[PDB]
């Protein structure tokens, strides 16, 4: 009989990509 | 020495629930297939009738659309023909190969029909097994819907439709009683003489029943005039035919030659082996004649040749008598009170259960057969798992938020009024805090490359390895497990992560990292299943699509496990101000499903991994069984005026058409998970044909409902989870089967919208507090689960309780077990052994059946990695003192340590 | 396992067909593994 | 649409042959009004659709009932074909169509 | 293809689905996310690719888009072969963008 | 196939009867105890 | 009067080419659901 | 028969938004 047990005690680390800059509000603007 | 004798009804008898039976079948082939082929059979001579015909009949891709037009009336005399002849064909063949009944025989049987059942009859007499009868039958089904098609256009060249009919058919015969045959039929002179009635146009006496009872045909007009001339103490009942039958005035040999062309001539055909008793003609018993010579007969009995009804019973006795025979067992398919056949024949006169089918064989075809769901692990807001996501919705928590600096700063991308480009006027949502979360080690990312990855392929990889060890799922274990029978849908409508993130210095991995398809890739390739991987995007019902598509490769035997899931990361502001510059999404809060002062909905974060098995599977496996899927229809909003908006007509027509599917009712649903967007016209749309498919009311107002139903929305405590909101619904729905428990709806802030029906009058409820959701004693809770998208697709599933588990299992005479535990990393080590002991307190004294339980769950139901512990004791207090003296070691600094590569010698 | 044979030596020790057209519609295959015609 | 059904005056040996001929609901119709007629005991009209030379012959009644079977097929072609009728003129015998 | 929606049984609306392969949405991240309007989500996502087809020609049947990458035309003329071989429709609209 | 696809009649004990050499016995019983198609499957599927 | 001999075979025929046919039977109802059923009884013994 | 016939002569116009100014290169830099 299958037993609902803990899940598996990952190794967690943060892995991300800030967005930064607000850039996507100037999207087609020129460099200025 | 008994005779059955097997006797085929008119149209007199209701054969509406005799096919929806039929159509339930899944256990006899032949039958499946005769029933498939029926209705292109039927089709095909629709396609020839004349374009009045073709206008006044319904279109039709299986004949379950038939019955309730058959039911209500409205279906023309040539389908209901062939529906009639569909119906004693298919419950005869079923008799007889499905009920293992011998086939009828010459020496022991005889056959007999009157008017459509004269076809059937002759069918079967040509016919010596159920194989050779099929093509046959076929035949006879095209004779059929040629018979009324003839009679209908002779009636309607007779006398027009009525004004007042809305689309019924009247009737053209009725019965009467209190006289005998030969004083109505001088009535019917006189009454003709005194009208003046063209010859044609004449009523006729049509049947004789008995020495009292009779039956009279004629135009509805003229045969209601008629009728209103015989009065008490005579009888007047109204029968069922809608054309006219049994007229020498009106048909000659051109119409019955006319209805047999189209059985092609050949030398091959079968004669008439078995005796059919034509009581109705000069020779009571005939045989011997070619299959078309003998459909010519019996479509004569029904056009040319007055039913004798009064001859049958003692037609069939002389029978009986002519062989020896003593007595006779009737064996009536669709006959008018045919319990009445069996005293009225032998009057005349002087008067082991199944075996076990080999293993593998009791099953039932893959296709419609029950998808059980094994596990579902997934991340939603403030919840890092299925049970915190409980913790959600049992507490009438709302998760909405503006939205955190970690994604986009909202001083410079929301505004109360909006004028700047790319700026939104909300920045609200549901939100995954720790979905930058991952374990690059354990699926082997290099540090540089995790970054790349969008966070929705990580989420998956670990909501689906979880579902993977919480079904005891070890690939190549089982013939299910095996790794090329597995496979990978998931629903994913945005790639976020590629359009903002990685896109600010695309690197190496900027392409397998953000694109969808990767999404189920990753796992295929990660657990090496080599089954298929596909990813759906049908916009906000992309998840429930998904577990669309995967359920019917289930059915057709592409896979034998397959995992389904949804995810939905929100990065790129651009996606909420486009969102919000459609007008889609709530400006002041999170979905306020049913609420009058509902203005949108709220984007909303999860991912949810699911694993599937067909029911018989399963148990094979004794995999752990949350809920079954009994059936899953999608269809598309075709009909609105606008692109965006969804409509009601088309979402009834599904939410009907997977309870025809299933077999089910409204009272066997009990809940309906809703999309519920918080929409004025959404919530108003939906809840209107959510009622009218579950809730309907009488004529008279009263609820059809005899038990309440309650209807509720997730969204309104998790947000829209877009590609992901089906499989939230649905994790809902198997916490809701666990706990027993329906959760309060946090959705009406102030008042209920008031475009909705009266609920309570069609006792149907908006849970405010929880509310007990009992399991029935031997019964299950039904669901009703719905999902659609702003593209027009609707999609929607029913589910069921799990079957109950096998009551007897064994007791384990070994007196000492073993548990195993192991991880790919020193930390996870750690933590494993810490998550087990605090495990084994909680279930410390339930029962002694746990320890074997638990060892056969972690050793012969998980892989097991390089960093291993192991544990071994008579009892559970034993391996929790060994746990815990390892993790001592563990914690004083010794380090876990992988075994050596190669093993052991 | 050689049965041409068989005939022949049973009897020493001792001393046509047609098919009917299918009904329209009933010729064809299931639609289950039936050719898809690209239109 | 206004429908004109003609009156008996202008009718022609052979009229409605081609229809007979090429159209098998026009060739049903007719062949159904054929089998009623002789059911009420009146003359059969289906000669008059394929002979053409039973025209010179043919009675007022067998020219009249002709006349009629002639309009009840071809208006029924017509409404078939897509042709529903705002309202129906007839003139002497046309008024019976 | 001839196809006139409800002419025949096989093209009924309700017996029409739609399927296409599509694994990109550029549009959206570089031409009308330079001015991001009213029109923004439904014109960029992909699930109206087929939408838009199933919404003009009013086929009620199935809408699906399918991604495999480089794989998602085929993946999806697998997908609509397989619901005409189950009979969940009768005509299919495959095609890759 | 050959009795129903191949529309051949079922045997019976006045014209016809069943042999089979090893794997061939099983299979005669099968037959021999059935009377027609639709009865020999479960006990043909037992013998596999 | 004559009298057809139902005669099965041994290991010895090969078969190989006898279910190659029979999986591309489709005409045929009762085999199909044969051929679906006879795997899984073969593979629960 | 269903003959090979011309397809509708769609009555076409350009509709287009134009990438401009090579922002996309720019991704995650400040204005400037």
């Not at chain 2, 019917?188 to 029943?209: G, N």
């Not at chain 2, 003229?222 to 015989?230: G, P, R, V, Y």
Request: hydrophobic fraction near 40%.
């Amino acid at each position: 009989k299958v037993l609902e047990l803990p899940a598996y005690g990952w190794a967690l680390k943060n892995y991300w990509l800030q967005y930064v800059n607000d850039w996507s509000l100037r999207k087609g603007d020129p460099a200025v | 020495a008994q005779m059955r004798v097997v006797a085929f009804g008119d149209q007199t008898y209701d054969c509406s629930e005799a096919v929806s039976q039929l159509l339930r079948v899944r256990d006899d082939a032949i039958v499946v297939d005769f029933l498939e082929r029926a209705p292109a059979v039927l089709k095909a001579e629709l396609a020839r009738l004349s374009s009045e015909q073709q206008e006044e009949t319904p279109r039709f891709a299986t004949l379950a659309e038939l019955v309730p037009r058959y039911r209500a009336g409205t279906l023309n005399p040539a389908v209901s023909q062939a529906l009639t002849c569909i119906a004693q064909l298919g419950l005869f063949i079923r008799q007889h190969s499905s009920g293992q009944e011998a086939y009828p025989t010459a020496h022991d049987s005889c056959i007999t029909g009157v008017c459509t059942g004269a076809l059937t009859a002759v069918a079967v007499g040509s016919a010596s097994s159920v194989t050779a009868l099929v093509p046959l039958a076929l035949h006879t089904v095209a004779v059929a819907v040629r018979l009324g098609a003839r009679a209908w256009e002779i009636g309607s060249c007779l006398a027009d439709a009525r004004r007042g009919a809305n689309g019924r058919y009247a009737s053209w015969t009725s019965a009467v009683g209190g006289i005998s045959p030969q004083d109505l039929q001088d009535r019917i002179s006189a009454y003709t003489a005194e009208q003046a009635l063209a010859s044609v146009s004449v009523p006729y006496l049509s049947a004789a029943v008995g020495p009292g009872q009779s039956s009279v045909s004629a135009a509805p007009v003229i045969l209601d005039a008629f009728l209103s001339t015989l009065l008490r103490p005579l009888t007047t009942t109204r029968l069922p035919i809608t054309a006219p039958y049994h007229a020498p005035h009106l048909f000659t040999a051109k119409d019955v030659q006319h209805v047999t062309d189209c059985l092609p001539p050949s030398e091959a055909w079968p004669t008439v082996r078995i005796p059919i008793i034509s009581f109705s003609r000069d020779e009571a018993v005939s045989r011997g004649a070619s299959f078309p010579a003998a459909m010519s007969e019996a479509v004569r009995d029904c056009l040319i040749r007055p039913i004798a009804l009064d001859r049958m019973a003692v037609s069939i006795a002389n029978h009986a008598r002519d062989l020896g025979k003593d007595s006779v067992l009737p064996s009536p398919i669709a006959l008018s009170f045919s319990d009445k056949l069996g005293p009225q024949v032998n009057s005349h006169l002087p008067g082991s259960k199944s075996i076990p089918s080999a293993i593998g064989a009791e099953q039932q075809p893959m296709a419609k057969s029950p998808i059980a769901i094994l596990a579902a692990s997934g991340r939603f807001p403030q919840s890092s798992s299925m049970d915190q996501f409980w913790d959600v919705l049992i507490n009438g928590v709302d998760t909405h938020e503006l939205v955190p600096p970690t994604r986009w700063n909202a001083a410079t991308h929301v505004s109360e009024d909006p004028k700047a480009k790319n700026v939104s006027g909300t920045g609200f949502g549901c939100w995954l805090h720790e979905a930058g979360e991952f374990d690059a080690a354990y699926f082997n990312m290099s540090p540089r490359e995790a970054p790349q990855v969008d966070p929705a392929q990580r989420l998956a990889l670990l909501t689906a390895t979880e579902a993977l060890e919480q079904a005891g799922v070890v690939p190549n274990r089982t013939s299910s497990t095996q790794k090329n029978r597995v496979g990978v849908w998931y629903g994913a409508t945005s790639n976020d992560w590629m359009e903002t993130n990685s896109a600010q210095n695309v690197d190496t991995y900027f392409i397998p990292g953000g694109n969808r398809a990767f999404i189920p890739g990753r796992v295929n390739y990660f657990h090496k299943f080599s089954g298929p991987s596909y990813t759906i995007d049908t916009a906000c019902s992309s998840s429930l699509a998904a577990l669309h598509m995967a359920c019917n490769a289930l059915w057709r035997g592409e896979v034998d496990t397959a995992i389904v899931g949804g995810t939905n990361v929100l990065t790129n502001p651009d996606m909420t101000a486009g969102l919000d510059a459609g007008h889609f999404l709530s400006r002041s809060g999170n979905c306020k499903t049913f609420d009058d002062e509902a203005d949108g909905y709220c984007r909303g974060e999860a991912v949810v991994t699911l694993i599937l098995k067909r029911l018989p599977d399963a148990q094979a496996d004794k995999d752990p069984i949350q809920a079954s899927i009994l059936g899953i229809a999608t269809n598309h909003s075709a009909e609105a005026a606008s692109i965006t908006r969804p409509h009601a007509g088309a979402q009834q027509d599904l939410f009907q058409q997977v309870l025809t599917e299933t077999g089910l009712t409204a009272n066997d649903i009990s809940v309906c998970e809703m999309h519920g967007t918080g929409t004025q016209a959404g919530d108003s749309g939906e809840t209107t044909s959510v009622v009218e498919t579950l809730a309907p009311l009488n004529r008279s107002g009263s609820a059809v409902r005899t038990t309440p139903l309650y209807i509720g929305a997730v969204k309104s405590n998790v947000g829209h989870a877009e590609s992901a909101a089906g499989v939230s619904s649905l994790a809902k729905i198997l916490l809701m089967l666990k706990h027993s428990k329906i959760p309060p709806h946090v959705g009406i802030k102030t008042k209920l919208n008031h475009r909705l029906p009266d609920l309570a009058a069609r006792n149907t409820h908006i849970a405010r507090s929880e509310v007990p959701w009992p399991r029935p004693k031997n019964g299950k809770r039904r669901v009703l689960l719905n999902n659609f998208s702003a593209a027009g697709g609707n999609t929607c599933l029913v589910l069921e309780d799990a079957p109950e588990p096998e009551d007897s299992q064994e007791v384990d005479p070994r007196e000492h077990h073993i548990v195993a535990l192991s991880a790919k990393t020193p930390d996870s080590m750690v933590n494993n052994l810490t998550n087990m002991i605090t495990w084994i307190d909680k279930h410390s004294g339930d029962s002694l059946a746990t320890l074997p339980q638990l060892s056969y769950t972690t050793t012969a139901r998980r892989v097991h990695h390089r960093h291993r512990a192991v544990a071994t004791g008579t009892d559970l207090l034993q391996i929790r003192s060994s746990l815990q003296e390892q993790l001592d070691r563990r914690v004083s600094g010794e380090r876990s340590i992988p075994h050596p590569p190669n093993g052991p010698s | 396992s050689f049965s041409d044979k068989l005939g022949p030596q049973v009897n020493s020790h001792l001393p046509t067909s047609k098919s009917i057209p299918s009904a329209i519609g009933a010729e064809q295959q299931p639609m289950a593994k039936s050719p898809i015609a690209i239109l | 649409f206004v429908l004109a059904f003609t009156g008996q005056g202008s009718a022609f040996a052979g009229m409605g042959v081609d229809l007979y001929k090429r159209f098998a609901s026009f060739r049903s119709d007719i062949a159904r009004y054929d089998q009623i007629c002789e059911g009420m005991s009146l003359p059969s009209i289906k000669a008059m659709f394929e002979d053409e030379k039973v025209f010179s012959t043919a009675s007022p009644t067998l020219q009249q009932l002709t006349h009629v079977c002639f309009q009840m097929a071809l208006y029924r072609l017509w409404k078939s074909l897509g042709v529903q009728a705002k309202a129906v003129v007839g003139h002497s015998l046309g008024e019976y169509a």
